[PDB]
Write a protein that binds this ligand. Structure first.
Ligand SMILES: CCCCCCCCCCCCCCCCCCCC(=O)O[C@H](COC(=O)CCCCCCCCCCCCCC)COP(=O)(O)OCCN
Ligand SMILES: CCCCCCCCCCCCCCCCCCCC(=O)O[C@H](COC(=O)CCCCCCCCCCCCCC)COP(=O)(O)OCCN
Ligand SMILES: [Fe+3]
Ligand SMILES: [Fe+3]
Lengths: 290, 290
């Protein structure tokens, strides 16, 4: 069969020939493209032995930084624009549906199940925010059996997993919308968010002259039987980082207003225990039938 | 700063513009080439959300499989031909030295320091082999203060790094050559080597219809003051896998003969405890001046 891999040209030709053995058509195509690009990158850059070693070390450290609650490989994808590119290709603003946005590294399915009026945030975790809307079809009809996975930074600038003690989740939950599609829950106003700088991605951003900021945002991931899954986020207006999100997640249609309500009776009705005032985020979620 | 990342074209243009912030000129060039290739790969393949997820999972698992005894990221580089391509670019044969070959995943930082006539292998680790030669410059000058880091599979087809109990290293050592460049040590005859399939790389080889075999080989990593470090391997002739090395390491100039020697006096002189026959591998190492 194949000649000894004596030269760069032969190494590439041999590896490309071996792609033929991949049985699955799609995986074969992906592998052909991967080899082509990997080999071109190495040849075009004349990657040094030391640069290769450093790359091995970085990728290893990236994987080793990952836990069930912090995905450093997602974060790497995010800061290099891969995550946003995949999102744009896969979820084109195609029907009248709420637009898609990046997941990011801090999603977990270890979040509490909640009914409407419950809170995703413990007390003393930031300025009160109430989030509400209806889950609707593009035809305007209510969507039953919808669940909203939602998560955010606390008002102090940290996701729950970035603290040393996590005895329970915080500033996240799985909210079950009602039969008429209505959802409503307590939360806190999210703050401009500095991406964690204590792993390989932080080092990459420093070495490449990048800031590490995301604008304020609230993740919204919605599923319902009969509808396409939406992964998205709302971005409160007026944040100085909206036009320079480090992970390219902001879209104009996902920028939202917050309205302040200073009515102690209303705050208590909504379940806020320390009363006073809250900011209101009212926005429907529009899903596309499957 | 930049327009909202609303489309795939804008995402890529924004990321490429941000590469300009990288201060180091070489790192800037590498990042720009990396972004270009990553983005092109995603667009050319229309990579799906699920395929992205699966890739994140694979890369994470690969990093988490890595230890001081097993470099799964090196193995991944190896099976995709990247390692061999880097080897060829960085040690072009025109310089006149011994050719490079793949490091592989089983180099360790704990090999014993040894002197000429010592063994890298405990008893009952395979058939006896003696390795010898002289370290020379391309210009002919003998090289003082050279060390030969050498490692190989045991005669059952496993590196010490694969053992559940590894109280000491085995079938590896750092042999200090003499002032005149001469080295000599006892070893075992290397056997055809099956790459362990219990990590991500094994799954990748299965999914892509590949075998997991390397021909018999003895790693040789030679360092000396005033010379370029050589990372190479000798490949005994006659092995059925030489023509289909899974990691593209074999080069005709690195294929060696082994002499069968039945000479009891010589066997004892060379330090073989049981005497009897041994295979002799005699090959000089030619290093390139800095
Ligand atoms: C098939 C499509 C593409 C194929 C062709 C391209 C692939 C080649 C693979 C990468 C090869 C070299 C990468 C170029 C490095 C440029 C980085 C310049 C800045 C710099 O040196 O930063 C340091 C090293 O970072 C680094 O070494 C960062 C490495 C980044 C690799 C990212 C690979 C893509 C993965 C992203 C996720 C995508 C998954 C879904 C596709 C930061 O570190 P330090 O030196 O300060 O500290 C020590 C480690 N902690
Ligand atoms: C440095 C760049 C880092 C990111 C890569 C840039 C481009 C992104 C590529 C994404 C798409 C992958 C393209 C090929 C398709 C996969 C191969 C087909 C076979 C297949 O699906 O294999 C499964 C998944 O493998 C896989 O998912 C294999 C992914 C391999 C990508 C590695 C690229 C880096 C090469 C290493 C070089 C080191 C740095 C030096 C420059 C085997 O797995 P399974 O399905 O059994 O279960 C795995 C969980 N364990
Ligand atoms: Fe977030
Ligand atoms: Fe080996």
């Amino acid at each position: 069969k194949l000649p000894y891999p004596e030269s760069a040209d032969v190494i590439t030709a041999n590896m490309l020939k071996l792609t033929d053995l991949t049985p699955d058509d799609r995986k074969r195509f992906l592998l052909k493209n991967l080899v082509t690009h990997l080999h071109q990158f190495v040849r075009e850059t004349s990657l040094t032995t030391q640069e290769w070693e450093e790359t091995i070390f970085f990728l290893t450290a990236t994987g080793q930084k990952c836990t069930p609650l912090r995905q450093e490989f997602i974060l790497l994808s995010d800061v290099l624009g891969v995550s946003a590119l995949v999102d744009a290709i896969n979820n084109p603003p195609v029907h009248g549906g709420t637009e898609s946005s990046v997941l990011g590294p801090f999603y977990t399915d270890d979040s509490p199940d909640l009914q409407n009026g419950d809170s995703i945030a413990s007390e003393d975790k930031g300025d009160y925010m109430y989030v509400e809307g209806r889950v609707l079809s593009t035809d305007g009809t209510p969507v039953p059996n919808a669940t909203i996975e939602t998560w955010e930074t606390d008002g102090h600038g940290f996701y729950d997993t970035q603290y040393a003690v996590r005895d329970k989740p915080d500033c996240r939950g799985r909210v079950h919308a009602d039969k008429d599609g209505h959802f409503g829950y307590r939360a806190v106003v999210p703050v401009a968010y500095p991406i964690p700088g204590d792993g390989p991605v932080g080092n990459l951003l420093l070495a490449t002259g990048r800031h590490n900021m995301r604008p304020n945002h609230l993740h919204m991931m919605v599923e319902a039987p009969g509808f396409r899954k939406l992964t998205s986020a709302w971005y409160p207006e007026g944040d100085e980082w909206l036009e320079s999100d480090a992970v390219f997640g902001v879209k104009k249609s996902l920028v939202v207003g917050l309205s302040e309500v200073r009515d102690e009776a209303e705050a208590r009705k909504r379940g806020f225990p320390k009363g006073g005032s809250f900011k209101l985020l009212h926005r429907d979620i529009i899903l596309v039938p499957e």
